[PDB]
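Task: complex structure prediction.
Instruction: return structure tokens for all chains below.
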Amino acid sequence: FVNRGGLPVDEATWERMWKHVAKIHPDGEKVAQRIRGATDLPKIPIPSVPTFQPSTPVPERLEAVQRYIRELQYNHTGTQFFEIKKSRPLTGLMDLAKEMTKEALPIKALEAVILGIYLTNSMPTLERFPISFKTYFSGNYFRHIVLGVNFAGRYGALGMSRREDLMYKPPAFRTLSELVLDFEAAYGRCWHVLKKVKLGQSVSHDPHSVEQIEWKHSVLDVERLGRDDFRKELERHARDMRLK
Amino acid sequence: SAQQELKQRQRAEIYALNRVMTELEQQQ
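Output:
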């Protein structure tokens, strides 16, 4: 379920969220009874958007950006509070990123990618590009996405995930293949087969850009490629970005 | 503001809910 009428959440989207909780949680109705209209709920602090001294190295800034993203918390409610239309102009998506920082609600992988671009537009020596995954577990397909980053010729990632090892990577990987193979290993450890990796182009640092994000500049079928060709195609995508 | 009070009330219920559902998903 996706909130499609912005904030505050309209009456219909709100009931739907609480209907969904009623079916998913064993005590679903008791959860709604305890929370809905409760006058003794914790006040959640609005997390502070991190701002950076020009003396702070980019890797340290990325740590603060990831901490901010984590502080919003992974959205387990079953209702996404922000609609992300992936084909929208960057300027529209960065308007959404700003509203995410002002309203400060839980988020999932795609929202974290938009936030990551927004909070690193101040870092022109950092290149940002989305990396999407399609995985298989127990007869079902799963989709995930992170923000690949490149600083000083080394690859890292920002993002939001259920699992610690499927989001943040410090920019220490010497090649793009070493970064993506670390994700593939993490998936292998939680018994997922990696089927496809989709790699985007460098995103503009201009938050008023009318350009779209290119999400699928490279689509790599891991199984059809095999080990060697998969590394070659990842390295080819790394060169394409460095030269453009 | 009525709209602000509404977002504050909703935000507090969203995080109380998110804690409960995080604890649920934590015990698959």
